[PDB]
């Protein structure tokens, strides 16, 4: 190609510093400017090369403040290499100067107008690439003429169809639904699958605003789709990728069909069902190659078919088969197929013909979450569990989430903890289950548990005699682990202060073991925490006369009595003066069990 | 497949060719372009044989470049670097003390298994080497070997080898023997260098004078691990350390001080020498606090601890711990911490005017810490409480929202330790009530009306104001306002029979907070049982009506509504 | 001792690094990048202990030079050594900048095998080194204020005004976020004061936010900025950041289509800022589908209502402290049979005000000096305010 | 639809950049940096899909190079991931065992290949056979 270009590039590679690179770019910039301005004109090889070197430089980062006019002259060369490099430059560097867009729309006209498909392709490509309103006003009328004309070549038809598609998106008012409508639909029958691919892209965008105009696409789309999925080894050899027939055009065709309701003609709706039943069948056939490219090509088509099925929501047999095929992906090497499976199943859970099918796979979703490394797949697992969860599952799902939380990373706790608390409340089979869930929730992952939540669990335990012993033992047994969440020491301390009497029977959990445990958490706790623990400690002087001495010691300490904090100093002084200045019989009614909560509708039952 | 992994063209083909150019000037450039490649994570793996060929040279720069390459593999891919063993054995034999050390460092930075077979005999050569660059290198490489598998009873010979190296011409070999050995020490069994050592310490405290500044830092640190048995033992060590009052600015002075602190208490306390030492540490500590901002940080954190124990060491030099506008916040605070701990009755003239200089600046964070730190200058020293309360009511008058709210809080923490004293203040303080958004400063104003509900007739019509939005308050406030309005009642039981219903009714009946509910009930039950045991629990000491109580508790019930 | 040495760019991309012990793998390089370089909501220190391991950093222009040691070792030493390293580097190539590190990869390896063996500070002084080091470095190379202004009282007000913008996935991934800020100064200062202004290092000096800064014409540069302010109110600087934003609220949406009849919506919002600070004028705007029958809406903090014309549930909260959480739940009825293609959901949007800069900008100092007149800095009264405001704060559902 | 196609290296150096959307040069720079950030993190145990601003990116690494397609959220992930591989096979045949340097010295040829297989944000031609036959025909012209 260009000995010059390779030296400039390989010079730029030998540069041992940004300094020297910029030295070398300014030297080359100087030379180019000199020769454009210079006395002796340049042969096409040099206009081509130096225009190419300006492009390179611009792509390294540097501003290019000249050369556009040189690139514009190459558009009028009859040497392909010179046209290309010129057409390349104006597509990368779009400048506003009206004298150039006039000259450019000239070169484009002279190329569209040549009956040369290489020169027409460069021009069509330049239009698609740049897509300027001047280019649209110049050429939008012509492109449909080129697309339909019977003598224009396939390669040009492809490039014309995508050009017309850029033109519709950037400048729709220059693309009305004229006399070509139906002839673009006819392209869907072309021998050239590349043409079919192009036309399908175009019709799909056009069929969104103008669905009525392109109605006749539905039938040819189905005909072609079913000819492709059913074809042999020796059919479509050109468009066959790792033993999968025309995967990208299959996917395009199924996307076109999502522009319309299920076919109005039965025969077609029939061809379409045979078509999707074949695609789902190929999913149960073992790999024709161990190359991951075969599985991805295959599945690309499966997943599109599943979008179409979901969108039609009209054929319950296909919704079920789709679900079950997704189920079989949740167990799979490919993190990719795992991700897409859980995504599609989240969708299917909100249709009725499929909600029940999805529940089926609860077993596989919970097992896939337990083993799953990639966090985003984990997230999607927990979204599905959350989606399928009703009266039947609620216990299984809550149970399994709490299990996961034990060993879980931090990366995911906050959202799981949130989902547990929500489902606990929506699907409460009874007090005792709720309380058991929230006490374990707080034990495992209290750091992420709302105030509103741990307020409610206490309200429940106070108001139900049945569960107070459960609460006292669970929270006690939890509290005597080596580290535990501050929100557990709040719920723990409040419960034991009010109901610790029902487990003080055991020498496991004596008032002095209870107290010393609470107080081995105390100096580690926040101030509202320590405040509450003090009310627990005074409720403890009352219930358990044995340990009033030890407790009064901790209230008399200077760390309690002369505390920087005001609630603490005041509580430790109030609670000391109470265990002195009151008799047995007064202290017993100033710390009698707290009366059950006024039970408004806000929560239960 | 292997798309874009060709070795038959591209950047690796071109390099592999440059690596075999018979013009060594192009081989050197190749091995750089390879090194440069690794650094940006290219797979220069294919080249290893060709880079290791470049070692077949009598050129120093070219060999050293090939080392640099294998080293990069040492840390990441120890497995890769095993393959060039025979080179490192031979490259300690080379008659150049540049290459000799260079062969050692590179074997000892390979961390796999085989390495023992090859490395043990050439480390013998280099410990008894005729160059102190190769000796300081092997002395560190002993450490590297102890770090790989096998305690090795021959490595028990290398322990002598190291101790042997503590006696040496060159204190940079002494230096790296200390360092090496104390690392080795704190692993496997304990008690593995406490020799006789009075000549050991003696080599070390001669070393500590003529040594490269990092040798001292390794030394002084081991010195500081030892307990002397007598007075003049510890008291002499001290005397030879005296000159480390400068060395490597901070990394020395400090490791010195660490020692002089340990061996100032195992001094009698006598006030014979003890005294001389204590006026010698005041200068050198204060020198560190003008070096680089980050070391100032590490100094102030060791000073603070030092000044927890021996406050008098720098009673004199409080002047060199004030704050400069351009000091990093983490230095502003460590300084502030020490100023608090040097606050005599002498210097609060200065200090409490340097704490005002701060509370007036733009850095909100530090400003908040300064006005709290005035509180600390009132709590720690009774005398200045009156001057302190001056400064605070000055800042309250600049009307700066966040300075007002921090100040009114500290004032309360003063009304707590110095009660029934400051009292003409409460009526000045409530002139700012309208704009107290921070929930701390609110509660402070609530408790101040709590106590001193009888110094103010107004008290009734403020406590009611804060009950209007009882929820949407900090539970901290809801707890201060509970105690305050059971405090107003146990002082004027009549005109405040109003405010006790609502608060005790919103704690017992409206709030879901069990800790607040608890205290509503605990208070409500105290007024119910006998309003005389309630009186005595709830109000402390100083510095038969009762009808008008019991007529009012028989009147109040508690409703949600 | 010094278990690892790492040199990063402003982005937090490791330019050059060397590990010494084996406690300091992938585990280490990152913990420093996460907890310090991309520290959102912490005002740091030079020393950062992170689960056993300790971290020491100095900052040069756009560079982080960082030491790791899993064992706890002579703090002061580690520092001193780094300063000597930065002394040995600059003696070969001057500025410790991204570029010069990039030009000198091979030099710098050669220094690190010398200046530091197994993490032990060696002869790190030039004169000693010219002998062991082959490679050489590659170095590369008034109009707005009136005369005679006076005021009984000299005051200045600084207002830090930021707008924070977020798009977030329903799974909480930050898709895109930018802050747009300015510092307004209101100066009643006598004379012609030269002002020296200092802040933290958070502002570097269908549309795609680019980190940029513009100053008033009165601003001169060399770190901190100095100027003679215009009299009264004026805009000192305007900026936009993209890196390391403190997002005051996380919105957690839980929508569930129960067929095509009912629509179940729980939205939880979590204030992610210091517990002592209050956000204000909080608003949450949950959109509803165009075909909505009735709506049942229960919330336990604030108030909320369905606004049919605006096709949305609006939830309002007056104040909300940091590290708190609130929940709204809504039950939405739908009368459908319309097109096969279901509701394409617009995102949930918040308004709020907060008293800090979501960029993490902090005003460290403002020294006022006036050559002629009496007064000095000590004399000047100085308010600073921080107003952070919701921009477009969108969470997909 | 396709918004842009990037070929980048571990170092972050762009080797091809094709835009099917309007962007200021400043934006393009930001977008190229933002992409390198996302993709070079991810170990080979991550998905080849990831949400990006208000679109999403489908990527695969071949040796030192990341091939990236930014597309609308609704666009088929597996179709576009195999579109990348199909593109790379065509590059591999045209350049006879492709290497990163081919993409540098022949950057202007590479735009030709892109425009054959992609145009106006859509797949255009997938037949490796047809694209090579065209590419070698073009290569022999003057
Ligand atoms: O290698 P080519 O592509 O054929 O181009 C070169 C080259 O041009 P550029 O470097 O500017 O691209 C110049 O030689 P070098 O600068 O590479 O050494 C030189 O032009 P000048 O010497 O006039 O600056 C020379 O032209 P000449 O024939 O005068 O040597 C010209 O080669 P051609 O003119 O044969 O194309």
Numbering used by the authors:
A (entry chain AAA): 9 to 613
B (entry chain BBB): 4 to 546, 557 to 574
C (entry chain MMM): 1 to 141, 159 to 222, 239 to 255, 261 to 435
D (entry chain SSS): 1 to 142
Wording from the paper:
Proper operation of the pivotal CME cargo adaptor AP2 requires membrane-localized Fer/Cip4 homology domain-only proteins (FCHO). The AP2 complex, composed of α, β2, μ2, and σ2 subunits, is pivotal to mammalian CCV formation, and its deletion is embryonically lethal in mice. FCHO1 and FCHO2 are similar in overall domain arrangement —folded N-terminal acidic phospholipid-binding homodimerization F-BAR domains and C-terminal folded μ-homology domains (μHD) separated by a ~300-residue, low-complexity intrinsically disordered protein linker, which has been suggested to participate in AP2 activation, although how it does so is undetermined. We dissect the network of interactions between the FCHO interdomain linker and AP2, which concentrates, orients, tethers, and partially destabilizes closed AP2 at the plasma membrane.
We were, however, unable to crystallize AP2 core in the presence of free FCHO2 linker. To increase the effective KD of the interaction between FCHO2 linker and AP2 shown by BLI to have a KD of ~10 μM and thereby improve the chances of isolating crystals of the complex, a number of chimeras were made consisting of different combinations of blocks attached to different AP2 subunits. AP2 was in its closed, inactive conformation (not unexpected as no YXXØ cargo peptide was present). (A) Structure of AP2:β2FCHO2linker chimera showing the position of the bound N3 helix (red) and InsP6 in orthogonal as indicated. In comparison, AP2:β2FCHO2 linker chimera showed ~3-fold tighter binding to GST-TGN38 due to faster on and slower off rates: Note that this is in line with speculations in but is only relevant to a situation in solution and not in vivo where TGN38 cargo is membrane embedded. The position of FCHO N1 and N2 on Cμ2 and N3 on β2-trunk could function to provide anchor points on a closed AP2.
